[PDB]
Amino acid sequence: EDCPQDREELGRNTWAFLHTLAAYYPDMPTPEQQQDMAQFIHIFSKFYPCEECAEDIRKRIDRSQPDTSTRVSFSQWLCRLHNEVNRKLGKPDFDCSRVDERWRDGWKDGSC
Amino acid sequence: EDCPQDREELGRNTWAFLHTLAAYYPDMPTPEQQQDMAQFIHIFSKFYPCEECAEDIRKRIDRSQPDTSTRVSFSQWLCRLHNEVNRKLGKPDFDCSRVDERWRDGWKDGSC
Ligand SMILES: Cc1cc2nc3c(=O)[nH]c(=O)nc-3n(C[C@H](O)[C@H](O)[C@H](O)COP(=O)(O)OP(=O)(O)OC[C@H]3O[C@@H](n4cnc5c(N)ncnc54)[C@H](O)[C@@H]3O)c2cc1C
Ligand SMILES: Cc1cc2nc3c(=O)[nH]c(=O)nc-3n(C[C@H](O)[C@H](O)[C@H](O)COP(=O)(O)OP(=O)(O)OC[C@H]3O[C@@H](n4cnc5c(N)ncnc54)[C@H](O)[C@@H]3O)c2cc1C
Known about the structure:
Chains A, B: FAD binds at residues 7-15, 19, 48, 79-91, 102-103. Chains A, B: Residues 3-103 form the ERV/ALR sulfhydryl oxidase domain. Two copies of one chain form a homodimer. The first copy, chain A, is mainly α. Chain A has one domain (1-112): ERV/ALR sulfhydryl oxidase domain (Four Helix Bundle (Hemerythrin (Met), subunit A)), CATH 1.20.120.310. Chain A has five helices and no strands. The two termini of chain A are 23 Å apart. At the A-B interface, helix 1, helix 2 and helix 5 of A face helix 1, helix 2 and helix 5 of B. Residues 7-8, 11-12, 14-15, 19, 48, 52-53, 56-57, 79, 82-83, 85-86, 89, 91, 94, 99, 102 of chain A line the site of one flavin-adenine dinucleotide.
């Protein structure tokens, strides 16, 4: 908009960035790309703006390190992580089998 | 609404994340944090989902590496980077002296 992001706005926008990032990550990433994405996620968890949120995500990420082996493993890992936060906030579980429809290709019914 | 984000949508929300990220970066970051934020930016530039956009930012970063010494230096560095992209796309130059109002504290006129 025009004013500082609130917790929810920052969240929606960051998840959008993260899921899209994962959606276009290589299906066949090189060993270096796999190392970089894992490190990116690690650093991300240390600087995500919302203080309370970062403390929370770090604990979740340390418990289940990102699997950056492939586009699918990574996008699924990220979907599972987001779902953990969804459950913490009483939000619905997202069907991870549809992450590509949501963030890359659009719903199969063509509503996008 | 819940559809894959186009170049403009992704960009808008990613800049929001990035500027908020810089807005809350420590005023006195540890050397470790300064190293981490620099790498975050470098990895970010290699994976940002819009290939043309990623290549462009990489070229700009290579000419002026991120200054992660302080919250102010980094926020200003990021504002300058975004302004280069604005100039490229014919968008108005943003007054970097007002980055804190825009992304952290809100406009001085209490508008927010
Ligand atoms: C790393 C991180 C940590 C956070 N921690 C906290 C916290 O501790 N406490 C707190 O109050 N808030 C936290 N937030 C904010 C919170 O997650 C939400 O972003 C915010 O409440 C806004 O919710 P929303 O309903 O708009 O959807 P999100 O912003 O919840 O939703 C983004 C959208 O993505 C889709 N989506 C939902 N789940 C998934 C999934 N699993 N996989 C793929 N797509 C999905 C949906 O289409 C949805 O509308 C965090 C955000 C991030 C990015
Ligand atoms: C790393 C990166 C690279 C990109 N590369 C390209 C590219 O090569 N080609 C292309 O077409 N698009 C590119 N984009 C997309 C483009 O920059 C815009 O995000 C998009 O056109 C939408 O524009 P917008 O007008 O909504 O504002 P941005 O999305 O331009 O604006 C976000 C908002 O932030 C504020 N703002 C503007 N400038 C600054 C600043 N300098 N400092 C602090 N706040 C500011 C404003 O309040 C503005 O409305 C890129 C985005 C990112 C995040």
